[PDB]
Amino acid sequence: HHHSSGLTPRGSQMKKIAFGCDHVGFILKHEIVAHLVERGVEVIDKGTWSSERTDYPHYASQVALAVAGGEVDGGILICGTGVGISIAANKFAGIRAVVCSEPYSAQLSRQHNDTNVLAFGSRVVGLELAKMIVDAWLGAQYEGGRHQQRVEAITAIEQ
Amino acid sequence: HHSSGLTPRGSQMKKIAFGCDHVGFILKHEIVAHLVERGVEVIDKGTWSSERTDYPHYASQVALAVAGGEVDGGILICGTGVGISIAANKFAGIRAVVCSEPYSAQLSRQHNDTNVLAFGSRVVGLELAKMIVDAWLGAQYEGGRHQQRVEAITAIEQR
């Protein structure tokens, strides 16, 4: 095949992912899940399954609790904006969710913040950009070192 | 002039607590300048130089003021904006949005009634950062059905 990209997706560092989205984020579900699978990750689908209106806090909770309980390597959430569901996830102890609309913020969130949950908006980003964003997040690895102090600090606040 | 296609709505927040990384410092003066140009009283919580410093501290200064009702909202800038927003969201009563475009910031306000905005000085340019803050300051929480979702967020944090 082609090897034409300028930025190559490094192999995923997370083997199984817990997935969640609301009725608006559902617009990207299939294709995103399909992408995850094609990149070799096992997807634990925590709903939903339709565009019928539903509440994002539940999906953020399902994936959040799974990620925290160590039953999955990471979590991926999608709502129209990604912001709300992202906040909900960050409210759980042991969770560090990043919401963004470009690759850099995602890649760096892993590297310096060791994030375990990624979110984006189906109404903000297209499918291709979204996939590049997930690639960047999945392939990235935490760098530790001076950052362990900052992440350690975030766990302190969770007080 | 009146030449813009999107008009910045008069600011709903009259006083906010600002905070930043040594990397976010890159945008401090111009953003605070813009804030003041919009008629908002900025409560500067450092840092004040490009010398390395930990972002968790400043996310804590702003958050505590936001929750303590001694300011109408908070704004944070680190290299990416992700780290500080995660830190901020860990504080009870705080709902922080991190983004790189105006839509997310505006909607986070309307539906999630966010009280903390964060962005990256290495991700977004100055003019885009200003647009995003206009979208955030001028937007208003729509309540209604979205109130259940916001209530759902506080519920999970306290339990």
By three-state DSSP, how is residue A99 classified?
Answer: strand
Residues of the binding site of B for D-ribulose 5-phosphate: 21-22, 79-83, 112, 122, 145, 149
DSSP letter for A56, please.
Answer: H
Give residue B140's domain range. 1-159
Q: Given strand B41-44, what is the order of strands in its sheet?
A: B41-44, B15-20, B73-78, B116-120, B96-98
Q: Which residues of B are catalytic?
A: 78, 111
CA distance A73 to A104: 21
CATH number of the CATH domain containing A81: 3.40.1400.10
A150/B90 Cβ within 8 A: no
Domain count, chain A: 1
DSSP annotation of A10:
P
Cβ A54 vs Cβ A60: under 8 Å: no
Distances (CA, A) of A12 to A75, A137, B30: 13, 9, 39
Q: How far is CA B147 from CA A10, A41, A87, B5, B103, in A?
A: 41, 36, 15, 31, 20
Q: How many CA atoms lie within 13 A of B152 on its CB side?
A: 20
Q: Which residues of B touch A98 (CB under 8 A)?
A: 82, 86, 98
8 Å CB contact of A101 and B99: yes
Residue A114 labeled ligand binder: no
Resolution of the coordinates in A? Answer: 2.2
B109 by Cβ neighbours in 10 Å (0-12 / 13-18 / 19+) ranks as buried
Contacts of A113 (CB under 8 A, 6+ apart): A96, A98, A142, A147, A150, A151, B82, B83, B86
Are A105 and B54 in contact (CB < 8 Å)?
no
SS (H, E, C) chain B: CCCCCCCCCCCCCCEEEEEECCCCHHHHHHHHHHHHHCCCEEEECCCCCCCCCCHHHHHHHHHHHHHCCCCCEEEEEECCCHHHHHHHHCCCCCCEEECCCHHHHHHHHHHHCCCEEEEECCCCCHHHHHHHHHHHHHCCCCCCCHHHHHHHHHHHHHC
Distances (CA, A) of B89 to A62, A80, B50: 18, 20, 25
Q: Whose structure tokens read 């296609």?
A: B5
